[PDB]
Write an enzyme that holds these catalytic residues in place. Structure first.
Site, PDB file in Angstrom:
ATOM      1  N   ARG A  53       0.878  -1.417  -0.304  1.00  0.00           N
ATOM      2  CA  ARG A  53       0.114   0.212   0.009  1.00  0.00           C
ATOM      3  C   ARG A  53       0.582   1.816   0.094  1.00  0.00           C
ATOM      4  O   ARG A  53       1.718   1.397   0.628  1.00  0.00           O
ATOM      5  CB  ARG A  53      -1.102  -0.191   1.334  1.00  0.00           C
ATOM      6  CG  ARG A  53      -2.166   1.074   1.579  1.00  0.00           C
ATOM      7  CD  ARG A  53      -2.480   0.792   2.582  1.00  0.00           C
ATOM      8  NE  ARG A  53      -3.533  -0.045   2.169  1.00  0.00           N
ATOM      9  CZ  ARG A  53      -4.515  -0.369   3.572  1.00  0.00           C
ATOM     10  NH1 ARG A  53      -4.136  -0.463   4.818  1.00  0.00           N
ATOM     11  NH2 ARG A  53      -5.182  -1.672   3.574  1.00  0.00           N
ATOM     12  N   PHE A  58       1.445  10.609   1.779  1.00  0.00           N
ATOM     13  CA  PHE A  58       0.850  10.295   3.543  1.00  0.00           C
ATOM     14  C   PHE A  58       1.939   8.983   2.968  1.00  0.00           C
ATOM     15  O   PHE A  58       2.799   9.677   4.601  1.00  0.00           O
ATOM     16  CB  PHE A  58      -0.577   9.162   2.868  1.00  0.00           C
ATOM     17  CG  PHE A  58      -1.769  10.571   2.694  1.00  0.00           C
ATOM     18  CD1 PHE A  58      -2.165  11.010   4.064  1.00  0.00           C
ATOM     19  CD2 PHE A  58      -2.118  10.659   1.572  1.00  0.00           C
ATOM     20  CE1 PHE A  58      -2.605  11.838   4.161  1.00  0.00           C
ATOM     21  CE2 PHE A  58      -2.657  11.759   1.605  1.00  0.00           C
ATOM     22  CZ  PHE A  58      -3.675  12.914   2.370  1.00  0.00           C
ATOM     23  N   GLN A  61       3.021   1.636   3.278  1.00  0.00           N
ATOM     24  CA  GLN A  61       3.159  -0.126   3.912  1.00  0.00           C
ATOM     25  C   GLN A  61       3.615  -0.956   3.124  1.00  0.00           C
ATOM     26  O   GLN A  61       3.362  -0.903   2.293  1.00  0.00           O
ATOM     27  CB  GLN A  61       1.463   0.411   4.562  1.00  0.00           C
ATOM     28  CG  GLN A  61       1.043  -0.940   5.420  1.00  0.00           C
ATOM     29  CD  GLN A  61      -0.333  -0.071   5.807  1.00  0.00           C
ATOM     30  OE1 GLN A  61      -0.779   0.611   5.211  1.00  0.00           O
ATOM     31  NE2 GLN A  61      -0.970  -1.603   6.405  1.00  0.00           N
ATOM     32  N   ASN A 100      -1.554  -1.447  12.033  1.00  0.00           N
ATOM     33  CA  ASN A 100      -3.348  -2.281  13.394  1.00  0.00           C
ATOM     34  C   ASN A 100      -4.389  -2.193  12.832  1.00  0.00           C
ATOM     35  O   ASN A 100      -4.513  -1.337  12.266  1.00  0.00           O
ATOM     36  CB  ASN A 100      -2.436  -1.600  14.572  1.00  0.00           C
ATOM     37  CG  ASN A 100      -3.059  -0.490  14.876  1.00  0.00           C
ATOM     38  OD1 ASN A 100      -4.198  -0.197  14.342  1.00  0.00           O
ATOM     39  ND2 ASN A 100      -2.614   0.741  15.761  1.00  0.00           N
ATOM     40  N   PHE A 111       4.654   1.221   8.641  1.00  0.00           N
ATOM     41  CA  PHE A 111       4.515   2.108   7.485  1.00  0.00           C
ATOM     42  C   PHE A 111       4.981   3.509   7.994  1.00  0.00           C
ATOM     43  O   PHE A 111       5.453   2.940   8.807  1.00  0.00           O
ATOM     44  CB  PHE A 111       3.039   3.293   7.256  1.00  0.00           C
ATOM     45  CG  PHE A 111       2.349   3.424   8.091  1.00  0.00           C
ATOM     46  CD1 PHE A 111       2.138   3.043   9.561  1.00  0.00           C
ATOM     47  CD2 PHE A 111       2.656   5.189   8.814  1.00  0.00           C
ATOM     48  CE1 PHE A 111       1.932   4.150  10.740  1.00  0.00           C
ATOM     49  CE2 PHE A 111       2.325   5.124   9.375  1.00  0.00           C
ATOM     50  CZ  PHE A 111       1.797   5.057  11.192  1.00  0.00           C
ATOM     51  N   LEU A 120      -2.856   9.515  13.245  1.00  0.00           N
ATOM     52  CA  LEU A 120      -2.395   8.697  13.749  1.00  0.00           C
ATOM     53  C   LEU A 120      -2.198   8.534  15.404  1.00  0.00           C
ATOM     54  O   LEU A 120      -1.587   7.662  15.978  1.00  0.00           O
ATOM     55  CB  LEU A 120      -1.986   8.177  12.894  1.00  0.00           C
ATOM     56  CG  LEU A 120      -2.204   8.345  11.524  1.00  0.00           C
ATOM     57  CD1 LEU A 120      -1.243   7.898  10.747  1.00  0.00           C
ATOM     58  CD2 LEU A 120      -3.892   7.521  11.463  1.00  0.00           C
ATOM     59  N   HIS A 124      -1.470   4.955  16.476  1.00  0.00           N
ATOM     60  CA  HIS A 124      -0.386   4.213  15.983  1.00  0.00           C
ATOM     61  C   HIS A 124       0.875   4.086  17.069  1.00  0.00           C
ATOM     62  O   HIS A 124       1.185   5.366  16.918  1.00  0.00           O
ATOM     63  CB  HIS A 124      -0.081   3.767  13.894  1.00  0.00           C
ATOM     64  CG  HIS A 124      -1.315   3.718  13.631  1.00  0.00           C
ATOM     65  ND1 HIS A 124      -1.265   2.423  13.280  1.00  0.00           N
ATOM     66  CD2 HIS A 124      -2.673   4.256  13.492  1.00  0.00           C
ATOM     67  CE1 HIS A 124      -2.752   2.752  12.357  1.00  0.00           C
ATOM     68  NE2 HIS A 124      -3.427   3.810  13.000  1.00  0.00           N
TER      69      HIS A 124
HETATM   70  C1  LIG Z   1     -11.469   8.231   4.005  1.00  0.00           C
HETATM   71  C2  LIG Z   1     -10.219   7.998   3.112  1.00  0.00           C
HETATM   72  N1  LIG Z   1      -8.718   7.203   3.646  1.00  0.00           N
HETATM   73  C3  LIG Z   1      -7.371   8.275   3.958  1.00  0.00           C
HETATM   74  C4  LIG Z   1      -7.573   9.636   3.510  1.00  0.00           C
HETATM   75  C5  LIG Z   1      -7.404  10.313   4.629  1.00  0.00           C
HETATM   76  C6  LIG Z   1      -7.500  12.234   3.653  1.00  0.00           C
HETATM   77  C7  LIG Z   1      -7.402  11.635   2.851  1.00  0.00           C
HETATM   78  N2  LIG Z   1      -7.321  11.154   1.665  1.00  0.00           N
HETATM   79  C8  LIG Z   1      -7.621   9.430   2.052  1.00  0.00           C
HETATM   80  C9  LIG Z   1      -7.340   8.685   1.079  1.00  0.00           C
HETATM   81  C10 LIG Z   1      -5.759   8.994  -0.106  1.00  0.00           C
HETATM   82  O1  LIG Z   1      -8.585   9.036   0.394  1.00  0.00           O
HETATM   83  C11 LIG Z   1      -8.463   7.935  -0.839  1.00  0.00           C
HETATM   84  C12 LIG Z   1      -6.568   7.701   5.371  1.00  0.00           C
HETATM   85  C13 LIG Z   1      -7.249   6.509   4.768  1.00  0.00           C
HETATM   86  C14 LIG Z   1      -7.596   5.073   5.928  1.00  0.00           C
HETATM   87  C15 LIG Z   1      -8.063   3.587   6.294  1.00  0.00           C
HETATM   88  C16 LIG Z   1      -9.308   3.973   5.264  1.00  0.00           C
HETATM   89  C17 LIG Z   1      -9.388   5.268   4.489  1.00  0.00           C
HETATM   90  C18 LIG Z   1      -8.282   5.819   4.211  1.00  0.00           C
HETATM   91  C19 LIG Z   1      -7.621   2.812   6.816  1.00  0.00           C
HETATM   92  C20 LIG Z   1      -8.194   1.446   6.521  1.00  0.00           C
HETATM   93  S1  LIG Z   1      -7.446   0.365   7.129  1.00  0.00           S
HETATM   94  C21 LIG Z   1      -6.388   1.782   8.162  1.00  0.00           C
HETATM   95  N3  LIG Z   1      -7.133   3.192   8.106  1.00  0.00           N
HETATM   96  C22 LIG Z   1      -5.304   1.159   9.018  1.00  0.00           C
HETATM   97  C23 LIG Z   1      -4.789   0.475   8.607  1.00  0.00           C
HETATM   98  N4  LIG Z   1      -4.690  -1.228   8.686  1.00  0.00           N
HETATM   99  C24 LIG Z   1      -4.435  -1.505   8.643  1.00  0.00           C
HETATM  100  O2  LIG Z   1      -3.709  -1.828   6.765  1.00  0.00           O
HETATM  101  C25 LIG Z   1      -4.138  -3.328   9.489  1.00  0.00           C
HETATM  102  C26 LIG Z   1      -4.017  -4.445   8.123  1.00  0.00           C
HETATM  103  C27 LIG Z   1      -2.900  -3.892   8.603  1.00  0.00           C
HETATM  104  C28 LIG Z   1      -2.938  -4.659  10.158  1.00  0.00           C
HETATM  105  C29 LIG Z   1      -3.089   1.191   8.879  1.00  0.00           C
HETATM  106  O3  LIG Z   1      -2.593   0.248   9.959  1.00  0.00           O
HETATM  107  N5  LIG Z   1      -2.437   1.680   8.515  1.00  0.00           N
HETATM  108  C30 LIG Z   1      -1.094   2.595   8.929  1.00  0.00           C
HETATM  109  C31 LIG Z   1      -1.092   4.188   8.628  1.00  0.00           C
HETATM  110  C32 LIG Z   1      -1.620   4.237   7.615  1.00  0.00           C
HETATM  111  C33 LIG Z   1      -3.072   3.436   6.935  1.00  0.00           C
HETATM  112  N6  LIG Z   1      -2.539   2.132   6.953  1.00  0.00           N
HETATM  113  C34 LIG Z   1      -4.046   3.879   5.641  1.00  0.00           C
HETATM  114  O4  LIG Z   1      -3.947   3.346   4.686  1.00  0.00           O
HETATM  115  O5  LIG Z   1      -4.034   5.502   5.372  1.00  0.00           O
HETATM  116  C35 LIG Z   1      -4.464   6.060   4.326  1.00  0.00           C
HETATM  117  C36 LIG Z   1      -4.774   7.246   4.159  1.00  0.00           C
HETATM  118  C37 LIG Z   1      -2.831   8.013   5.294  1.00  0.00           C
HETATM  119  C38 LIG Z   1      -4.347   8.085   3.124  1.00  0.00           C
HETATM  120  C39 LIG Z   1      -5.957   7.562   5.182  1.00  0.00           C
END
Ligand code: A1AOJ
Ligand code: GNP
Ligand code: MG
Lengths: 162, 168
Positions: A53, A58, A61, A100, A111, A120, A124
């Site tokens: 990912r 941002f 990961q 997580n 990440f 976050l 985290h």
């Molecule tokens: C509302 C859209 N939206 C945004 C966001 C917000 C503002 C502007 N634009 C966006 C995006 C680009 O618009 C499409 C986010 C974001 C994050 C999630 C779902 C939707 C999101 C999401 C799903 S699950 C999770 N967050 C935690 C996730 N958990 C898992 O993966 C567990 C499986 C393993 C063990 C996790 O720990 N991380 C480690 C921290 C970063 C994190 N992923 C992640 O991907 O943040 C994406 C990010 C940073 C863009 C935030």
């Protein structure tokens, strides 16, 4: 504080080395999990796994070495372990922090921030930072997308402790 | 060219939004949990004799991003509002999503379908009658589904298309 490295590849072609400082002085259990997984000394770890990912603006990961699909990963303490502390914050690019699925579900996924991600904080566990090779992380970004699906396979070809 | 319908799947984390959509599109189910950021899918179908294209937006359940739903709610034409029949909290969260869609679209007349997923599971905590009553209070259909067994999956999406059709 220990230092670890990842040698990054893109569709098998080498890109370069990223090295990390692990804040064992502040989060010893979480740093140790990442150190051990980088050396493979428990018999499993990051070598060969991919960054599944990548979202420009941002973070990058990775760390699912058990299922190789974004859903897996395990710690050296068991499948999951508790949040050690939230002392360190997501202050800017280069921060290394645990992924997580809610409270107390740290495994192996992690990440690397490419920007400040303050919302976050307290959710985290931050446990490290890029020491060398931030330009490699920056170069990884263009293989990502808005929802994080990558356009080439970005892999940890080798990793260990310095 | 065929009519396109912009469907949006909403609901709390883990209720089965993606499992429902991937059953629709790929005809398979996996028990693994891959949390969604945002995914889009297309599928051609025939509903009541009429060929059409489903453009499906599979959204994230994460409550911490509840302030970033407005644009996809403005853009979407119909909403699949999903809760899990073994998760009373997801049923409570449903009222919130419905009020949010209504507020953002500034309309009492938004096509939606209430979906009670995971009906294959024994640990049921939300009564059929509870959901029918809520759906009735909203003026929308209620469909029971299982992404695991495929029970109700087509029917849920096709009913939502019928709701959009009546609105237009
Ligand atoms: C509302 C859209 N939206 C945004 C966001 C917000 C503002 C502007 N634009 C966006 C995006 C680009 O618009 C499409 C986010 C974001 C994050 C999630 C779902 C939707 C999101 C999401 C799903 S699950 C999770 N967050 C935690 C996730 N958990 C898992 O993966 C567990 C499986 C393993 C063990 C996790 O720990 N991380 C480690 C921290 C970063 C994190 N992923 C992640 O991907 O943040 C994406 C990010 C940073 C863009 C935030
Ligand atoms: N038994 C059963 N399990 C289901 C059903 N639908 C989904 N699940 C399971 O519930 C978990 C979460 O499903 P998923 O589709 O990822 O949920 P989501 O609503 O998309 N979650 P998110 O908002 O994070 O994207 C998975 O382990 C999945 O296999 C169902 O009908 N029956
Ligand atoms: Mg999902």
């Amino acid at each position: 504080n220990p230092t670890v490295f990842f040698d990054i590849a893109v569709d098998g072609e080498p890109l370069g080395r990223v090295s990390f400082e692990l804040f064992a002085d502040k989060v010893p259990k979480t740093a140790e999990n990442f150190r051990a997984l980088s050396t493979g000394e428990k018999g499993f770890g990051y070598k060969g796994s991919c960054f599944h990912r990548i979202i420009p603006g941002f973070m990058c990961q990775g760390g699912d070495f058990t299922r190789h699909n974004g859903t897996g990963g395990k710690s050296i303490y068991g499948e999951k372990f508790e949040d050690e502390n939230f002392i360190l914050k997501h202050t800017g690019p280069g921060i290394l922090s645990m992924a997580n699925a809610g409270p107390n579900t740290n495994g192996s996924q992690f990440f690397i921030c490419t920007a400040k991600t303050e919302w976050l904080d307290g959710k985290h566990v931050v446990f490290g930072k890029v020491k060398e090779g931030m330009n490699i992380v920056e170069a990884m970004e263009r293989f990502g997308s808005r929802n994080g699906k990558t356009s080439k396979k970005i892999t940890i070809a080798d990793c260990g402790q310095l | 060219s065929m009519t396109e319908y912009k469907l949006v799947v909403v609901g709390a984390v883990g209720v089965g939004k993606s499992a429902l959509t991937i059953q629709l599109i790929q005809n398979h189910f996996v028990d693994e949990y891959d949390p969604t950021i945002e995914d889009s899918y297309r599928k051609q179908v025939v509903i009541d004799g009429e060929t059409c294209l489903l453009d499906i937006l599979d959204t994230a359940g994460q409550e911490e991003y509840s302030a970033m739903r407005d644009q996809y709610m403005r853009t979407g034409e119909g909403f699949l509002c999903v809760f899990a029949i073994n998760n009373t909290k997801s049923f409570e969260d449903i009222h919130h999503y419905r009020e949010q869609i209504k507020r953002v679209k500034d309309s009492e007349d938004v096509p939606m379908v209430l979906v009670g997923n995971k009906c294959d599971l024994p640990s049921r905590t939300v009564d059929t009658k509870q959901a029918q009553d809520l759906a009735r209070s909203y003026g929308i259909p209620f469909i029971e589904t299982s992404a695991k067994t495929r029970q109700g999956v087509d029917d849920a999406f096709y009913t939502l298309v019928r709701e959009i059709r009546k609105h237009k």
